[PDB]
Amino acid sequence: STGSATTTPIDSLDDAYITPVQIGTPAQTLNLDFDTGSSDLWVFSSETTASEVDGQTIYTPSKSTTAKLLSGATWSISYGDGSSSSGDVYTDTVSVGGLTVTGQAVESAKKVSSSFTEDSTIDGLLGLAFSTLNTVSPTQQKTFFDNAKASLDSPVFTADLGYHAPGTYNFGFIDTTAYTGSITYTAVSTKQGFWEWTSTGYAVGSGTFKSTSIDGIADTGTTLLYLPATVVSAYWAQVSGAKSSSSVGGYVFPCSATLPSFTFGVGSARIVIPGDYIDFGPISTGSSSCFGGIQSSAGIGINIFGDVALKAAFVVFNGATTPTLGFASK
């Protein structure tokens, strides 16, 4: 089997991407944030505290003939941005882009933090990291991908995120029309439950490539590119007037700037992030200070190849017995 679904930016900054997902019988379609940095499929629901729902579409398990309470199971998750959610668990039929999993754990939110409430466009998350990070207790649950894997034509999914445009998540096949040149594969460590890999270095603009190992995660659920302070300083040093602002919470730059590109290494291959991808616009409405899309990972504890990086590539998440990650230009 295979699946193919379009993913769409939630706003003009590509802050996140939503993908329609069919849950239950008859289908209830919710727009979920596919997150390769976590491993829970959770939804706004008929059980979510009413004051914490503001425009989201909810899953109502009582209206699904295939929903079953997973008795005794609870979940609770905290994300890197400080947001959180928790609740109980149903199993139900879940389909993405024509690919169906029966008996998927659908985690129903009883509580969500303010960041989720305030984002009316995101009806929940669909985790695509390794199932060892799943938070359901006392019986840990599998991700949608893990459950689908045995039925897939090939044990892979791909992320093809757009810059200010829709893109695609495919399951079970590699669309050879979706990228240019060849795909370069690189080793993954699953030790921390992430799609963790080592970039071979970087360049700023038209500068020389610096060969240096940068361990980090491929994380579709993180907006920006978070890299070591040394790398980030070298980037922003090439932008007149750019500075790190503790009051704003990262690097800012004059909105009048033209940003240089940023290149990262994948083995001997190179992925180029255009300068425009690194512009996250005014820090507040009407400001002439703009927020940078490359930020320091210092104090996160991990480097994160978020959407800023991933949307510059066609990315293969290879869930074969020995997992790997592939990157191609597009």
Side-chain angles (χ1 to χ4, degrees), residues 1-62 64-67 69-109 112-141 143-148 150-190 192-242 244-330:
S1 62
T2 62
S4 181
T6 299
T7 192
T8 302
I10 65 167
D11 61 23
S12 65
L13 297 180
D14 297 348
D15 280 317
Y17 297 78
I18 51 172
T19 309
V21 177
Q22 282 71 49
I23 309 175
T25 308
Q28 300 180 39
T29 298
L30 274 66
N31 297 328
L32 306 188
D33 184 351
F34 282 25
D35 181 13
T36 63
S38 70
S39 307
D40 288 50
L41 194 175
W42 73 261
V43 297
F44 279 78
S45 74
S46 56
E47 300 178 330
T48 309
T49 301
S51 66
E52 295 180 347
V53 182
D54 190 2
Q56 294 81 9
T57 294
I58 63 165
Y59 169 57
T60 303
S62 65
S64 174
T65 60
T66 42
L69 181 72
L70 186 62
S71 184
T74 58
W75 62 279
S76 182
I77 193 163
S78 298
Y79 297 99
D81 68 352
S83 67
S84 66
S85 53
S86 62
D88 57 14
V89 188
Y90 292 82
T91 57
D92 209 339
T93 302
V94 172
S95 300
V96 176
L99 168 67
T100 300
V101 167
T102 57
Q104 177 62 47
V106 177
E107 302 173 33
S108 168
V112 304
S113 65
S114 59
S115 170
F116 290 115
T117 298
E118 294 162 359
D119 193 346
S120 65
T121 66
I122 292 174
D123 301 326
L125 266 64
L126 189 149
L128 292 168
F130 293 88
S131 293
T132 53
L133 293 180
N134 176 266
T135 76
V136 177
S137 177
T139 308
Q140 190 173 57
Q141 302 294 306
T143 70
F144 175 82
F145 178 53
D146 208 340
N147 283 322
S151 301
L152 294 178
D153 290 357
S154 182
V156 305
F157 68 91
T158 64
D160 181 9
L161 303 180
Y163 168 66
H164 295 345
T168 306
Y169 282 102
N170 289 330
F171 292 83
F173 73 105
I174 289 159
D175 180 358
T176 58
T177 72
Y179 61 88
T180 57
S182 56
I183 306 174
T184 300
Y185 290 87
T186 196
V188 165
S189 171
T190 64
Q192 295 191 97
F194 299 120
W195 293 92
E196 185 170 4
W197 65 290
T198 302
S199 172
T200 49
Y202 71 98
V204 176
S206 59
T208 61
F209 187 84
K210 175 70 169 182
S211 292
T212 186
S213 293
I214 304 169
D215 295 339
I217 67 169
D219 185 1
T220 59
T222 291
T223 313
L224 307 183
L225 174 52
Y226 293 88
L227 292 172
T230 45
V231 177
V232 175
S233 183
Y235 178 81
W236 289 109
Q238 297 304 310
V239 179
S240 186
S244 183
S245 168
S246 55
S247 60
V248 173
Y251 281 90
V252 296
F253 67 93
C255 293
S256 60
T258 300
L259 297 177
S261 64
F262 183 90
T263 302
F264 63 94
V266 183
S268 59
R270 307 287 180 254
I271 299 295
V272 179
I273 306 172
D276 289 346
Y277 290 26
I278 299 162
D279 176 20
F280 279 74
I283 60 170
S284 298
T285 307
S287 179
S288 67
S289 289
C290 274
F291 197 70
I294 295 178
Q295 296 293 344
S296 179
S297 63
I300 294 179
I302 199 158
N303 300 305
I304 308 173
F305 293 86
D307 298 333
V308 163
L310 303 181
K311 74 180 78 167
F314 177 85
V315 187
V316 181
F317 295 78
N318 169 30
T321 309
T322 300
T324 65
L325 270 175
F327 291 83
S329 297
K330 66 187 184 189

Short mmCIF file of all heavy atoms in Angstrom, two decimals, residues 6 28 33 41 49-50 58 63 75 116 121 136 148 167 179 197 209 227 235 249 253 256-257 308 310, unseen atoms left out:
data_model
loop_
_atom_site.label_atom_id
_atom_site.label_comp_id
_atom_site.label_asym_id
_atom_site.label_seq_id
_atom_site.Cartn_x
_atom_site.Cartn_y
_atom_site.Cartn_z
N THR A 6 -1.42 16.08 0.72
CA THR A 6 -0.88 17.42 0.63
C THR A 6 -0.81 18.05 2.01
O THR A 6 -1.74 17.92 2.81
CB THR A 6 -1.78 18.27 -0.27
OG1 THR A 6 -1.80 17.69 -1.58
CG2 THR A 6 -1.31 19.71 -0.33
N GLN A 28 -14.13 11.42 10.21
CA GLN A 28 -14.00 12.77 10.74
C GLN A 28 -12.64 13.28 10.27
O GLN A 28 -11.61 12.70 10.61
CB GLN A 28 -14.07 12.75 12.26
CG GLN A 28 -15.37 12.19 12.78
CD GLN A 28 -15.47 12.16 14.29
OE1 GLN A 28 -15.03 13.08 14.96
NE2 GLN A 28 -16.06 11.11 14.83
N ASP A 33 -0.77 18.41 12.49
CA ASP A 33 0.61 18.83 12.31
C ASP A 33 1.49 17.58 12.38
O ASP A 33 1.69 16.99 13.46
CB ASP A 33 0.94 19.82 13.44
CG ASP A 33 2.31 20.43 13.35
OD1 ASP A 33 3.15 20.01 12.53
OD2 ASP A 33 2.54 21.35 14.17
N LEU A 41 0.01 10.66 18.39
CA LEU A 41 -1.05 11.15 17.53
C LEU A 41 -2.14 11.58 18.49
O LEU A 41 -2.79 10.74 19.09
CB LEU A 41 -1.55 10.05 16.59
CG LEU A 41 -2.43 10.50 15.41
CD1 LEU A 41 -2.76 9.32 14.52
CD2 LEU A 41 -3.73 11.17 15.86
N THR A 49 -11.31 20.29 27.40
CA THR A 49 -11.83 21.39 28.21
C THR A 49 -12.35 22.50 27.31
O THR A 49 -11.59 23.03 26.50
CB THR A 49 -10.72 21.96 29.13
OG1 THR A 49 -10.23 20.93 29.99
CG2 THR A 49 -11.23 23.11 29.98
N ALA A 50 -13.62 22.88 27.46
CA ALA A 50 -14.26 23.75 26.48
C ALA A 50 -13.54 25.09 26.33
O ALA A 50 -13.40 25.60 25.22
CB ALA A 50 -15.73 23.97 26.85
N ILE A 58 -12.93 19.13 16.18
CA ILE A 58 -12.74 18.11 17.19
C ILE A 58 -13.13 16.73 16.71
O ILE A 58 -14.03 16.57 15.88
CB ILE A 58 -13.52 18.47 18.49
CG1 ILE A 58 -15.03 18.51 18.24
CG2 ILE A 58 -13.01 19.78 19.09
CD1 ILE A 58 -15.86 18.49 19.52
N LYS A 63 -19.27 9.35 18.09
CA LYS A 63 -19.88 9.35 16.76
C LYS A 63 -19.19 8.41 15.78
O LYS A 63 -19.58 8.32 14.62
CB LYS A 63 -19.91 10.77 16.19
CG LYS A 63 -20.80 11.71 16.98
CD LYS A 63 -20.73 13.14 16.48
N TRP A 75 -2.12 9.78 28.59
CA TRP A 75 -0.95 10.33 27.93
C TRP A 75 -0.75 11.76 28.39
O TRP A 75 -1.68 12.44 28.83
CB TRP A 75 -1.11 10.28 26.40
CG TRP A 75 -2.25 11.10 25.90
CD1 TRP A 75 -3.57 10.75 25.88
CD2 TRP A 75 -2.17 12.40 25.33
NE1 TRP A 75 -4.31 11.76 25.33
CE2 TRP A 75 -3.48 12.79 24.98
CE3 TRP A 75 -1.12 13.28 25.08
CZ2 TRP A 75 -3.76 14.02 24.40
CZ3 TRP A 75 -1.40 14.50 24.50
CH2 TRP A 75 -2.71 14.86 24.17
N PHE A 116 -1.60 25.86 21.85
CA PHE A 116 -2.47 25.04 21.02
C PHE A 116 -3.85 25.70 20.87
O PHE A 116 -4.37 25.79 19.75
CB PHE A 116 -2.57 23.62 21.58
CG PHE A 116 -1.29 22.84 21.42
CD1 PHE A 116 -0.55 22.42 22.51
CD2 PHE A 116 -0.81 22.54 20.16
CE1 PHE A 116 0.61 21.71 22.34
CE2 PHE A 116 0.36 21.85 19.98
CZ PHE A 116 1.07 21.43 21.07
N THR A 121 -5.95 26.68 13.56
CA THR A 121 -5.73 25.90 12.34
C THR A 121 -5.19 24.49 12.59
O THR A 121 -5.19 23.67 11.67
CB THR A 121 -4.75 26.58 11.36
OG1 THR A 121 -3.43 26.64 11.93
CG2 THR A 121 -5.23 27.98 11.00
N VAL A 136 2.06 7.23 25.90
CA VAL A 136 0.91 6.54 26.49
C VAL A 136 1.37 5.59 27.58
O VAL A 136 2.34 4.85 27.40
CB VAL A 136 0.09 5.81 25.42
CG1 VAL A 136 -1.05 5.02 26.05
CG2 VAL A 136 -0.43 6.81 24.39
N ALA A 148 1.64 1.25 10.04
CA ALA A 148 1.46 1.06 8.60
C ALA A 148 2.57 0.29 7.93
O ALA A 148 2.37 -0.25 6.85
CB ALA A 148 1.33 2.41 7.93
N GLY A 167 2.91 21.37 -0.06
CA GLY A 167 3.85 20.30 -0.34
C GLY A 167 3.17 18.97 -0.11
O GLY A 167 1.93 18.89 -0.11
N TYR A 179 12.06 15.39 -7.03
CA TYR A 179 13.35 15.93 -6.67
C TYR A 179 14.24 15.95 -7.90
O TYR A 179 13.91 15.34 -8.92
CB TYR A 179 14.01 15.12 -5.53
CG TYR A 179 14.28 13.67 -5.87
CD1 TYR A 179 15.47 13.29 -6.47
CD2 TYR A 179 13.34 12.68 -5.57
CE1 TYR A 179 15.73 11.96 -6.79
CE2 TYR A 179 13.59 11.36 -5.88
CZ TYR A 179 14.78 11.00 -6.49
OH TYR A 179 15.05 9.68 -6.81
N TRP A 197 20.90 12.56 13.01
CA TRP A 197 21.90 12.34 11.97
C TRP A 197 23.02 13.37 12.15
O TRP A 197 22.94 14.22 13.03
CB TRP A 197 21.25 12.44 10.58
CG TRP A 197 20.71 13.80 10.25
CD1 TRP A 197 19.63 14.41 10.81
CD2 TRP A 197 21.26 14.73 9.31
NE1 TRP A 197 19.47 15.66 10.26
CE2 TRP A 197 20.45 15.88 9.34
CE3 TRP A 197 22.35 14.68 8.43
CZ2 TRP A 197 20.70 16.98 8.53
CZ3 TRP A 197 22.59 15.77 7.62
CH2 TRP A 197 21.77 16.91 7.68
N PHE A 209 33.01 26.23 2.18
CA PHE A 209 32.36 25.24 3.01
C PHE A 209 33.28 24.85 4.16
O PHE A 209 34.46 24.57 3.96
CB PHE A 209 32.04 24.01 2.17
CG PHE A 209 31.22 22.97 2.89
CD1 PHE A 209 29.84 23.07 2.96
CD2 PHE A 209 31.84 21.89 3.49
CE1 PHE A 209 29.09 22.09 3.61
CE2 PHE A 209 31.10 20.91 4.14
CZ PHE A 209 29.73 21.02 4.20
N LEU A 227 21.07 25.68 15.43
CA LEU A 227 22.42 25.17 15.22
C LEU A 227 23.36 25.72 16.30
O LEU A 227 23.00 26.64 17.02
CB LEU A 227 22.90 25.53 13.82
CG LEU A 227 22.18 24.82 12.66
CD1 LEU A 227 22.62 25.41 11.33
CD2 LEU A 227 22.41 23.32 12.70
N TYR A 235 26.87 32.98 10.52
CA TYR A 235 25.83 33.35 9.58
C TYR A 235 25.43 34.83 9.75
O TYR A 235 25.49 35.62 8.81
CB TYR A 235 24.60 32.42 9.71
CG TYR A 235 23.51 32.86 8.74
CD1 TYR A 235 23.55 32.50 7.40
CD2 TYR A 235 22.48 33.68 9.16
CE1 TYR A 235 22.60 32.95 6.51
CE2 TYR A 235 21.52 34.14 8.27
CZ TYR A 235 21.59 33.78 6.94
OH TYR A 235 20.64 34.27 6.07
N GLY A 249 14.34 37.27 22.06
CA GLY A 249 14.51 35.84 22.19
C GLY A 249 15.30 35.17 21.07
O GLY A 249 15.15 33.98 20.82
N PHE A 253 17.24 41.03 12.63
CA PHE A 253 18.00 41.71 11.60
C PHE A 253 17.13 42.81 11.00
O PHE A 253 15.91 42.77 11.10
CB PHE A 253 18.47 40.71 10.53
CG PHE A 253 17.35 40.10 9.73
CD1 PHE A 253 16.97 40.68 8.53
CD2 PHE A 253 16.66 38.99 10.18
CE1 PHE A 253 15.94 40.16 7.80
CE2 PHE A 253 15.61 38.46 9.44
CZ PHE A 253 15.26 39.05 8.25
N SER A 256 15.20 45.66 6.12
CA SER A 256 15.72 46.12 4.83
C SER A 256 16.83 45.23 4.26
O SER A 256 17.29 45.47 3.15
CB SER A 256 16.24 47.55 4.96
OG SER A 256 17.29 47.65 5.91
N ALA A 257 17.28 44.22 5.01
CA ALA A 257 18.38 43.37 4.58
C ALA A 257 18.02 42.42 3.46
O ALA A 257 16.87 42.02 3.30
CB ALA A 257 18.91 42.56 5.74
N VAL A 308 12.71 25.26 8.21
CA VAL A 308 13.58 26.14 7.43
C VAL A 308 14.57 25.34 6.60
O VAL A 308 14.81 25.67 5.44
CB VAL A 308 14.28 27.16 8.34
CG1 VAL A 308 15.47 27.81 7.66
CG2 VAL A 308 13.29 28.22 8.77
N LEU A 310 14.41 21.73 6.20
CA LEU A 310 13.81 20.61 5.50
C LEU A 310 13.07 21.04 4.25
O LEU A 310 13.04 20.28 3.28
CB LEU A 310 12.89 19.82 6.42
CG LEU A 310 13.52 19.27 7.70
CD1 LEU A 310 12.49 18.51 8.50
CD2 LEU A 310 14.73 18.40 7.41
#
